[PDB]
Amino acid sequence: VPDYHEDIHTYLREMEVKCKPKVGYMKKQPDITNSMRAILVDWLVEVGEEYKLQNETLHLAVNYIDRFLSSMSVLRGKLQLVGTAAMLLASKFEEIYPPEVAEFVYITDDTYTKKQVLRMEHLVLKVLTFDLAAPTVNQFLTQYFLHQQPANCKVESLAMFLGELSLIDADPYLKYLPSVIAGAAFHLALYTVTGQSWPESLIRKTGYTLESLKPCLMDLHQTYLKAPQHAQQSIREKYKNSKYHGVSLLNPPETLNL
């Protein structure tokens, strides 16, 4: 709580740089593309909904995938196996009650065996050298939420919605750090719902201004406006639920006036 707020934020700002995937890895993957990655992440959203997993678990799994794919060339028919092992690892790390391995085998419609999943689990842990406590967009968002006055459930849900959308598109979001995406997502959410802007108190905390967030914000605002048309729709569907205050039905602003 309050005694460690600053220490922890500082620490996560250090770790997010250390846990960043390489911006350019997809260029170096012969057999997979940003679009195939988009498909995988969209499926992971569905898995998360099927098993009622935390959003944090989804964010971690994506972080593990992008890091693994930064080191390891992977064939298209194996991408889903990587994804499944990452989501298993994320669940064991993050969830009170992770789904059993059999449940992960099942969700791949028996494309892979239990033995494959388990072997990939170990390989992923080796490639990542067990470094699983990665900062996510989510972890920064929940800290930023403490700087609302007053707290607004639609702002929070919408910011999470937007942060989650950025997981789908390697281009361009791979080049932004979690704390920066969270900054853009939080300002955008706040602006859409209440008309307010990135608060002074978060400039003091993060050192980010609307100016430093602009490029990410410009990208996020486009993603927002184009979300109904995106080939991947699982996040929009997920965020229609009242658990998330139906924020995907809110209208994006046509301009940010920045």
């Binding site: 709580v1 220490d7 922890i8 790390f93 699983l132 800290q143």
Partner: protein, 297 residues
């Protein structure tokens, strides 16, 4: 590589294997090897091992047991740890004669608090601070060990696993089924350990959750809305709970001086919000004359 290690003897055990004292044949370094059985079928790498390794890899601190390496040798995990000589429970038993010298209790509490503050500053809850998980060496160091039950928390926290912490060291907010618990649970545990180091017996040795709560209530008073706003609304609070008066705090740990008593009471505060942080405790007057003496045994 396993080849470079010579096993000496067994020194402990966990859920997924025993722990061996071993020595590096090349450097001479004495180490502890924590065996984690993996099984090709079943469930793969146990989440407790996944959490212990990944959290320990971030936690480099003189008062946290150092994970040196992780060895996968054909379907088991060996965690290579710095060797420590015994656990605090064994040392208290060995000190059943006369107590532990106060300079040493103070040194141990101060070091425990340093290790814990480091954990909490790095968003890690330990969740099983008990004397058996606190390791001492011959130079006067004490270190937090066994991070199998730990987890990385978020700010603010969400609901995590219930009924955590070995019962005797479990905080009232866990016992009362609160939706949220945080760093203050580890402080409660250290508070119980502080008391235990002085008396050499457990402060609240309950055998069930309700028994644990009642022992706490009889020592510190049954909490009302004055002492702990929200208590009566907590999921496992019951209005039929007996209403015990709060004891003269000098009677809880009679050998304690004014400063020690002050510090203990802030560690055993009912309201998690008011309970002292490990960070704030390091500057308590109790520690004004702290040194780090070698263990007397």
């Amino acid at each position: 590589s396993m080849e470079n290690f010579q096993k000496v003897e067994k020194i402990g055990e966990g859920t997924y294997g025993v722990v061996y004292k071993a020595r590096n044949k090349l450097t001479g370094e004495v180490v502890a090897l924590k065996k984690i059985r993996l099984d090709t079928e079943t469930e793969g790498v146990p989440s407790t091992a996944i959490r212990e390794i990944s959290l320990l890899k971030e936690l480099n601190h003189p008062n946290i047991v150092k994970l040196l390496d992780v060895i996968h040798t054909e379907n088991k995990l060996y965690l290579v740890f710095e060797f420590l000589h015994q656990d605090l429970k064994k040392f208290m038993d060995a000190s059943a004669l006369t107590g532990i010298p106060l300079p040493l209790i103070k040194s141990y509490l101060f070091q425990l608090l340093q290790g814990l503050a480091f954990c909490h500053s790095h968003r890690v809850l330990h969740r099983d601070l008990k004397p058996q998980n606190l390791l001492i060496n011959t130079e006067g160091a004490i270190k937090l060990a066994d991070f199998g039950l730990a987890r990385a928390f978020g700010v603010p926290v969400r609901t995590y696993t219930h009924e955590v912490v070995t019962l005797w060291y479990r905080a009232p907010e866990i016992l009362l089924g609160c939706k949220y618990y945080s760093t203050a649970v580890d402080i409660w545990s250290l508070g119980c350990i502080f008391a235990e180091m002085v008396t050499r017996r457990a402060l609240f040795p309950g055998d069930s959750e309700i028994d644990q709560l009642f022992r706490i209530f009889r020592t510190l008073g049954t909490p009302d809305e004055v002492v702990w706003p929200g208590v009566t609304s907590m999921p496992d609070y019951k209005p039929s709970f007996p209403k015990w008066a709060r004891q003269d705090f000098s009677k809880v740990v009679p050998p304690l001086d004014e400063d020690g008593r002050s510090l203990l009471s802030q560690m055993l505060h009912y309201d998690p919000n008011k309970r002292i942080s490990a960070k704030a405790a390091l500057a308590h007057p109790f520690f004004q004359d702290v040194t780090k003496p070698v263990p007397h045994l």
